[PDB]
Amino acid sequence: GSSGSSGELEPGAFSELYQRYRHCDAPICLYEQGRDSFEDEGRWRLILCATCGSHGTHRDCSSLRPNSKKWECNECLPASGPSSG
Ligand SMILES: [Zn+2]
Ligand SMILES: [Zn+2]
Fold this sequence. Notes:
This protein has strands spanning 47-48, 56-57. By secondary structure, the protein is largely without helices or strands. It has one domain: Zinc/RING finger domain, C3HC4 (zinc finger) (Herpes Virus-1). The two termini are 30 Å apart. It binds zinc ion (2 copies). Zn(2+) 6 binds at residues 24, 29, 58, 61.
């Protein structure tokens, strides 16, 4: 038998950001442009996470529904296992 673990984190670490983060970070993109471009109203509307509100990507790009209230980034959403399988 043995004991001893090593793992710490930085609590309350939200680096302020003057400019709004609008960099498509979704899993799959359909917009021909597939860039940080969005409209005021439409599927291609820049959507910011709800939990932390840091990530920013299109609507249909984040594989969401046409009747979704708010969307949350990955790190926030319950993703079984780390992105890097
Ligand atoms: Zn996108
Ligand atoms: Zn988030």
